[PDB]
C-alpha cells in the first residue's frame, strides 16, 4: 500500500518538477507518469503550454496548506537523483490535475511505477474529449 509523507515546498522548477524539503533535506521531485510541455526543455527550451503548465503547478503547490509526496512500488529516484512521486496539494493529486486540465499527457510508463496509471488515463481521455489546452 502506498502512503503519503509530508514535504515542504522550496521552489516549483517547471510543470513537472518541484524542489522540496523531504526528511530535513532539499530534494528535487519529478512528477510520476506525466509529461508537461517544458520551459527548460534540453534541446527545445520553451514549448507551447510550457509556461501555462509551469504556472499551474506553481500556483497549486504555493497556495496549498499541506504538500505531500507518495512514492510508487518501484524505484524511488531516477538517474538524475530526482525523487519519483505522486505529489498532493491539500489532498488533490497535482499529477492528475495537470492531465485533467489538458496541460500534460500521460508519460510512457515503467512497471512497477504504474499504480495510478489507469486513473490518469481516464483523466487524459476526458481532457481530450473536452479539447482542453494541449488537446484544443
UniProtKB/Swiss-Prot annotation:
Catalytic residues, chain numbering: 30, 38, 82
Region (Disordered) location: 116-136
Spans traversing the lipid bilayer: none
Subcellular location: Secreted
Residues noted as binding Ca(2+) in the record, renumbered to the chain: 16, 35-36
Protein name: Nuclease A
Biased composition (Basic and acidic residues): 116-132
Organism placement in taxonomy: Bacteria, Bacillati, Bacillota, Bacilli, Bacillales
Domain of life, per lineage: Bacteria
Amino acid at each position: 500500500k502506498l502512503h503519503k509523507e509530508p514535504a515542504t515546498l522550496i521552489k516549483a522548477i517547471d510543470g513537472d518538477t518541484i524542489k522540496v524539503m523531504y526528511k530535513g533535506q532539499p530534494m528535487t521531485f519529478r512528477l510520476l507518469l506525466v509529461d508537461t510541455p517544458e520551459t527548460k526543455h534540453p534541446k527545445k527550451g520553451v514549448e507551447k503550454y510550457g509556461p501555462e503548465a509551469s504556472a499551474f503547478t506553481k500556483k497549486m503547490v504555493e497556495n496549498a496548506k499541506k504538500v505531500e509526496v507518495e512514492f510508487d512500488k518501484g524505484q524511488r529516484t531516477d538517474k538524475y537523483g530526482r525523487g519519483l512521486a505522486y505529489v498532493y496539494a491539500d489532498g488533490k493529486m497535482v499529477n492528475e490535475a495537470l492531465v485533467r486540465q489538458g496541460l500534460a499527457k500521460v508519460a510512457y510508463v515503467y512497471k512497477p511505477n504504474n499504480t495510478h496509471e489507469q486513473h490518469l488515463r481516464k483523466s487524459e481521455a476526458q481532457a481530450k474529449k473536452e479539447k482542453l489546452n494541449i488537446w484544443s
